[PDB]
């Protein structure tokens, strides 16, 4: 199971889905922090 | 060899894999720097 989960983790369709959530978190944090400072 | 490596560097499946690591580094650095300031 570990080998299959890492092999599907090395795919394209998973990695776009990861970067979307990461960019969303960065955008919200950037806006909230810029508001504070 | 140099021509083939730059031609595969101009692809889609490589470039998504590059942007994922770059966004991850930016997110971790943003969180650590926001913690410090």
Index terms:
part of a larger assembly, 2 chains, 37 residues, mainly alpha, 2 helices, transport protein, Transient receptor potential cation channel, subfamily M, member 2
Q: Could you give a short description of this structure?
A:
The structure is cut from a larger assembly and holds 2 copies of chain A (37 residues). By secondary structure, the first copy, chain A, is mainly alpha-helical.
List the helices and strands and how they pair.
The structure is cut from a larger assembly and holds two copies of chain A (37 residues).
Chain A (H helix, E strand, L loop, with lengths): L1 H8 L2 H25 L1
Alpha-carbon distance between the termini of chain A?
46 Å
The number of E-state strands of chain A comes to 0
Q: Measured on Cα atoms, how large is the radius of gyration of chain A?
A: 15 Å
Helix content of chain A: over 70%
Major pleated sheet of chain A: none
Order of helices and strands of chain A: HH
Largest Cβ-defined interface: A-B, 13 and 13 residues
Going by helix content, strand content and strand pairing, the class of chain A is: mainly alpha
Figure out the total of helices of chain A.
2
- Regarding quaternary structure, what we see is part of a larger assembly
Shape annotation of chain A:
rod-shaped
Classify the beta-strand content of chain A into a percent band: under 5%
Question: Any overview of this molecule?
Answer:
The PDB classes it as transport protein. Keywords: transport protein. The entry is titled "Structure of TRPM2 ion channel receptor by single particle electron cryo-microscopy, ADPR/Ca2+ bound state". Chains A, B: Transient receptor potential cation channel, subfamily M, member 2. The organism of A, B is Danio rerio. The first copy, chain A, is mostly helical. The first copy, chain A, has two helices and no strands. The first copy, chain A, has helices spanning 2-9, 12-36. The N and C termini of chain A lie far apart (46 Å).
């Amino acid at each position: 199971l570990a080998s299959t989960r890492q092999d599907e983790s090395q795919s394209v369709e998973h990695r776009i889905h990861d970067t979307a959530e990461k960019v969303g978190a960065m955008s919200e944090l950037l806006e909230r922090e810029q508001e504070m400072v």
